[PDB]
């Protein structure tokens, strides 16, 4: 039994006093509030908030039985007796406390009937997690397939169909019960740590995510090369083998930006060497030459590092001596048995651990390393009596990887202020995106079920801040012989998800260049397609940096007033315009795609479909997976290159999908130098926009460029605009008032400026796109 006693308004925050203690409410923006219970006491600081000490002016009003604390869109309604806070956007009930806070740490809230709940991060349980209970304790799930209540990267956060996000801003071993134990109760609990939650509201799912990333952090734009092709396996055993793999990509004509080196770079065996963090010179004898030779071919090098230093490693004595390791309660270095052997964990929460670890990254980055892979940051083993500078293992567990990322991000920005850090990690916390974390879904089995779970995993992480969530393409764990069909399907899906990184245990090849002729004839043009689509992908990335909009969006974005779509985890949006339906079983002959009402085109075949609600049945083939294009889409391409180091947009090819049903459409292409962390902030970019206006007798395109440009930017781009489903009635074209006749023959066979292909229903326009506005008008 809890009740209101008294309140103060101080430094813009409302401090309430109950019979059981102090509660501090600070608005972190107009649509986001931090509620800290036990505000009187010493607690761990926030990990989730990008600006933990901010509070914006709010309107407090008092009545008899209630208080009302309001920012712009979000209102906290604080009932006095019994004490219960509830949350409103306008006068719509988002979320009400039941008992609220208790003692362990425990928060309890009501769930409205029919409310659907996404969240928890990586779980394979269904998209609506209501009716489920699971732990908040990051932990490996080696060889998972079609089920998991607990894996590498949990998030103490949910997204509701009421269009709010709730963050349990707590790093400790805990649990989430989403109306499982009691129908109508959401319960959050932890063993220790901060007793705080954060509620964020939105008018729509895009605005919600914008609001969320506003307060938890925005991903800075990764380097363009992160959207390229990675060569990876576990693992290249030598410099010779790694040079041969870069060579194989060249001699097989597959694009390649980055080669990833697994744990054999620092020692000849899986066991016994972890913590060396230095080249195994018997197997990598000339690594500066190696990395420089690769950079001559436009190829970057990424190295795996782990949080553990083994007692058998070259660096044990030094790490002990520097006080870099986490300690036991006696106060000496804590050592424990890992798979790899006996060892300690680097204390990234301490000054001495951070400096020691940072110095090692600095030395290797100076040698040529372009990016970093941080593996096992759950941490994979983490005994409860391990003591970090700010708390014990069970208190800090779910923030270890988060702090590892922050440490490494700050370090890379300090060493290379003109480059974008590349940081790939397995485990983090809410807001780790603000440190550039690129997560992957761990050690997935080489099974169809492993593939069939990846969309669910990607969407759950994308919705809560992680745009670059991806999988080990082809599958990682076990298997004895390649499942060729599953592999092909996985690398096809690969094209339409955030990072193109095939990776697996090296008894079966993960790289597409090591596959048979049929497999390479299928995948080679799709990996080239990935490169041709870089303007589309990089523009989605730019939008993610601006607004948190993820690259993969769920089907439920298409209709916010149909909550039944929340369950779908087989069809998703890649950017604004493509609905992708991966094939997740062997031998599937056709698919039923639940395309939103409107007009859609087969991406591969140009076929036009219209639907008023009913699904579309498409046949399948081995060469592709089913992709529909939304009418009104602008799909931009550039010619395929071997490496994004050679990237050029001097030649653009843009495909517009016309339909009279879409009378107004827009597209955007974001260009910059692909490497500068300050390009957006300083406006050192070239933002191309395209607007189509489609009426009964006219189709009109308005083209423009904004931004201050960048070094090497083309002043003029050769542009081919291909209009799919173009009317055969268009008589003439004006380009900036200059009339041009539309040829009706020989389009593929003449240097035609405007030509209609009657057999394909495509109108092709070729022109020069310079810095000034350009208007193209077609009239009947």
Ligand X SMILES: O=C([O-])C(=O)[O-]
Ligand Y SMILES: O=S1(=O)O[C@@H]2[C@H](O)[C@@H](O)[C@H](O)[C@@H](CO)[C@@H]2O1
> Which partner from the list ligand X, ligand Y, none does 112 bind, CB cut-off 5 to 8 Å by kind?
none
> Which partner from the list ligand Y, ligand X, none does 443 bind, CB cut-off 5 to 8 Å by kind?
ligand Y
Phi and psi for 229 in degrees, rounded to 5?
-100, 130
> Which partner from the list ligand Y, ligand X, none does 3 bind, CB cut-off 5 to 8 Å by kind?
none
> Which partner from the list ligand X, ligand Y, none does 727 bind, CB cut-off 5 to 8 Å by kind?
ligand X
Q: Is 432 in the site for ligand Y (CB under 6 A)?
A: no
Where helices occur in 496-611 by DSSP H, the ranges are 517-532, 534-547
- Candidates 651, 729, 731, 744; binder of ligand X (CB under 6 A) is 729
Residue 721 CB, shortest distance to ligand X, in Å, is 17
Residue 729 CB, shortest distance to ligand X, in Å, is 5
> Which partner from the list ligand Y, ligand X, none does 262 bind, CB cut-off 5 to 8 Å by kind?
ligand Y
Q: Is 592 in the site for ligand X (CB under 6 A)?
A: no
Q: Which residues is the chain interrupted after (C–N above 2.5 Å)?
A: 103
- Site track for ligand Y across 182-211, x = CB under 6 A: ------------------------------
> Which partner from the list ligand X, ligand Y, none does 660 bind, CB cut-off 5 to 8 Å by kind?
ligand X
Q: Helix, strand or coil for residue 418? A: coil
Residue 595 CB, shortest distance to ligand X, in Å, is 20
DSSP structural state of residue 169: -
Q: Helix, strand or coil for residue 212? A: helix
Considering only residues 100 to 159 of the shown chain, the ones binding ligand Y according to CB under 6 A are 142
Residue 274 CB, shortest distance to ligand Y, in Å, is 9
The nearer residue to ligand X, 227 or 658, going by C-beta atoms, is 658
- Site track for ligand Y across 439-458, x = CB under 6 A: ---xx---------------
Q: Could you give the angle at the alpha carbon of 260 between the alpha carbons of 258 and 261, nearest 5°?
A: 145
- Candidates 34, 128, 189, 262; binder of ligand Y (CB under 6 A) is 262
Count of positions on this chain that bind ligand Y (CB under 6 A):
8
Q: Is 727 in the site for ligand X (CB under 6 A)?
A: yes
> Which partner from the list ligand Y, ligand X, none does 578 bind, CB cut-off 5 to 8 Å by kind?
none
Residue 474 CB, shortest distance to ligand Y, in Å, is 13
Residue 601 CB, shortest distance to ligand X, in Å, is 14
Residue 442 CB, shortest distance to ligand Y, in Å, is 5
> Which partner from the list ligand X, ligand Y, none does 375 bind, CB cut-off 5 to 8 Å by kind?
ligand Y
Q: Helix, strand or coil for residue 617? A: strand
Residue closest to ligand X (Cβ): 727
Beta strands in 90-190 (DSSP E): 92-102, 105-110, 117-121, 132-136, 154-160, 164-168, 174-178, 185-190
Please identify which residue in the block is written with the tokens 């405007």: 754
Residue closest to ligand Y (Cβ): 234
- Site track for ligand X across 155-194, x = CB under 6 A: ----------------------------------------
The nearer residue to ligand X, 59 or 729, going by C-beta atoms, is 729
What would the two tokens of residue 2 be? 């809890």
Q: Is 234 in the site for ligand Y (CB under 6 A)?
A: yes
> Which partner from the list ligand X, ligand Y, none does 210 bind, CB cut-off 5 to 8 Å by kind?
none
Please identify which residue in the block is written with the tokens 């394979």: 124
Among 534, 546, 539, which Cα is nearest to 500's? 534
Beta strands in 620-761 (DSSP E): 627-630, 634-637, 651-657, 664-671, 686-694, 698-706, 717-724, 732-735, 738-741, 754-757
> Which partner from the list ligand X, ligand Y, none does 729 bind, CB cut-off 5 to 8 Å by kind?
ligand X
Residue 657 CB, shortest distance to ligand X, in Å, is 12
Number of residues written out for the chain: 780
Q: Is 263 in the site for ligand Y (CB under 6 A)?
A: yes
DSSP track, 69-92: EE-SSEEEEEETTTTEEEEEETTE
Residue 575 CB, shortest distance to ligand X, in Å, is 25
* Host H or E run for residue 62: strand 59-62
User: Three-state SS across 29-46?
Assistant: ECCEEEEEECCCCCCCCC
Maximum Cα–Cα distance across the chain: 87
CA distances to 671, 678, 687, 706 from 683, in Å: 11, 8, 10, 9
The nearer residue to ligand Y, 3 or 142, going by C-beta atoms, is 142
Residue 596 CB, shortest distance to ligand X, in Å, is 21
CA-to-CA distance for 132 and 125, rounded, in angstroms? 8
Residue 761 CB, shortest distance to ligand X, in Å, is 9
Where helices occur in 453-599 by DSSP H, the ranges are 454-462, 484-495, 517-532, 534-547
Q: Is 660 in the site for ligand X (CB under 6 A)?
A: yes
> Which partner from the list ligand X, ligand Y, none does 614 bind, CB cut-off 5 to 8 Å by kind?
none
Phi and psi for 463 in degrees, rounded to 5?
-65, -20
Pairing of strands 717-724, 762-769: antiparallel
CA-to-CA distance for 178 and 671, rounded, in angstroms? 43
Residue 306 CB, shortest distance to ligand Y, in Å, is 8
Query: How many angstroms from the chain centroid is the CA of residue 418?
Result: 23
Residue 760 CB, shortest distance to ligand Y, in Å, is 45
Q: How many CB atoms lie within 10 A of CB 668?
A: 18
Gyration radius (Cα) of the chain, Å: 27
- Bridge partners for 666 per DSSP: 691
The nearer residue to ligand X, 263 or 692, going by C-beta atoms, is 692
> Which partner from the list ligand X, ligand Y, none does 653 bind, CB cut-off 5 to 8 Å by kind?
none
Count of positions on this chain that bind ligand X (CB under 6 A):
3
Q: Is 375 in the site for ligand Y (CB under 6 A)?
A: yes
Residue numbers at the binding site for ligand X (CB under 6 A): 660, 727, 729
Residue numbers at the binding site for ligand Y (CB under 6 A): 142, 234, 262-263, 304, 375, 442-443
């Amino acid at each position: 039994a809890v009740f209101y006693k008294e309140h103060k308004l101080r430094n813009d925050g409302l401090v309430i006093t109950t019979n059981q203690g102090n509660i501090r409410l600070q608005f972190k923006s107009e649509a986001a509030i931090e509620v800290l219970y036990r505000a009187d006491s010493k607690q761990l600081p926030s990990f989730a908030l990008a600006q933990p000490e901010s509070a914006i002016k709010a309107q407090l009003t008092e009545t008899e039985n209630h208080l009302q604390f309001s920012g712009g869109t979000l209102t906290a309604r604080i009932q006095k007796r019994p004490f219960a806070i509830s949350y409103y956007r306008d006068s719509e009930l988002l979320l009400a406390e039941e008992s609220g806070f208790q003692v362990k740490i425990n928060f309890r809230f009501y769930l409205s009937p029919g409310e659907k709940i996404l969240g928890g991060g990586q779980r394979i349980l269904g998209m609506d997690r209501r009716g489920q209970r699971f732990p908040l304790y990051n932990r490996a799930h080696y060889g998972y397939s079609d089920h998991s209540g607990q894996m590498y990267f949990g998030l103490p956060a949910i997204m509701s169909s009421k269009q709010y996000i709730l963050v349990f801003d707590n790093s400790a071993s805990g649990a989430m019960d989403i109306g499982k134990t009691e129908s109508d109760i959401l319960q959050l609990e932890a063993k220790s740590g901060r007793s705080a939650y954060i509620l964020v509201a939105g008018n729509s799912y895009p605005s919600l995510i914008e609001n969320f990333t506003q307060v938890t952090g925005r991903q800075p734009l990764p380097p363009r090369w992160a959207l390229g092709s990675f060569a990876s396996r576990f693992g290249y055993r030598s410099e010779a083998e790694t040079r041969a793999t870069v060579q194989k990509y060249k001699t097989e004509d597959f694009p390649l930006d980055t080669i990833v080196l697994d744990l054999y770079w620092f020692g000849k065996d899986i066991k016994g060497h972890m913590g060396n963090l230095d080249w195994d010179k018997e197997n990598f004898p000339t690594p500066l030459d190696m990395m420089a030779d690769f950079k001559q071919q436009g190829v970057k090098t990424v190295l795996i590092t782990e949080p553990f230093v083994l007692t058998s490693s070259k660096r044990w004595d030094d790490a002990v001596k520097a006080k870099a390791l986490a300690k036991d309660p006696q106060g000496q270095p804590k050592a424990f048995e890992l798979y790899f052997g006996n060892g300690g964990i680097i204390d990234v929460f301490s000054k001495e651990g951070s400096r020691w670890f940072s110095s090692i990254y600095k030395d290797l980055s100076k040698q040529g390393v372009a990016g970093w892979w941080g593996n096992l940051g759950e941490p994979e083993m983490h005994p409860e009596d391990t003591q970090h500078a700010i708390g014990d293992a069970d208190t800090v567990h779910n923030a270890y990887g988060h702090r590892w990322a922050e440490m490494l991000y700050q370090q890379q920005l300090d060493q290379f202020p003109e480059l974008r850090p590349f940081i790939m990690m397995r485990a983090g916390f809410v807001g780790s995106q603000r440190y550039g974390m690129i997560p992957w879904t761990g050690d997935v089995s080489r099974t169809w079920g492993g593939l069939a779970s990846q969309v669910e995993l990607a969407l759950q992480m994308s919705l809560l801040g992680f745009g670059y969530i991806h999988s080990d393409l082809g599958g990682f764990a076990d298997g004895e012989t390649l499942d060729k069909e599953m592999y092909i399907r996985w690398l096809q899906y690969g094209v339409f998800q955030p990072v193109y990184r095939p990776h697996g245990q090296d008894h079966i090849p993960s790289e597409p260049v090591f596959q048979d002729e049929e497999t390479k004839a299928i995948l080679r043009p799709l990996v080239k397609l990935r490169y041709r689509m870089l303007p589309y992908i990089y523009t989605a990335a730019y939008q993610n940096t601006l607004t948190g909009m993820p690259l993969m969006r769920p089907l439920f974005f298409s209709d916010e007033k149909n909550p039944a779509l929340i369950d779908n985890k087989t069809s998703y949006f890649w950017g604004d315009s493509l609905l992708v339906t991966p094939i997740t079983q062997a031998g599937v002959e056709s698919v039923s795609i639940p395309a939103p009402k409107g007009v859609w085109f087969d991406f591969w075949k140009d076929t036009r479909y219209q639907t008023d609600g009913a699904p579309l049945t498409l046949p399948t083939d081995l060469h592709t997976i089913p992709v529909l294009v939304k009418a009104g889409a602008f799909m931009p391409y550039v010619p395929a290159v071997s490496t994004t180091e050679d990237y050029r947009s001097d030649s653009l090819e843009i495909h517009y999908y016309a339909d009279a049903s879409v009378p107004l459409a827009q597209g955007e292409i974001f260009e910059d130098d692909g490497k500068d962390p300050n390009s957006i902030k300083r406006n050192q970019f070239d933002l191309l926009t395209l607007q189509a206006t489609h009426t009964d007798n006219q189709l009109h395109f308005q083209l423009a460029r904004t931004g201050k440009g960048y070094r090497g930017m083309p002043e003029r781009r050769a542009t081919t605009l291909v209009i799919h489903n173009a009317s055969d009635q268009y008589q003439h074209l004006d380009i900036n008032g200059k009339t041009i006749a539309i040829a009706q023959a020989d389009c593929a066979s003449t240097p035609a400026l405007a030509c209609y292909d009657q057999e394909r229903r495509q109108l092709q326009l070729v022109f020069t796109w310079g810095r000034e506005a350009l208007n193209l008008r077609l009239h009947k």
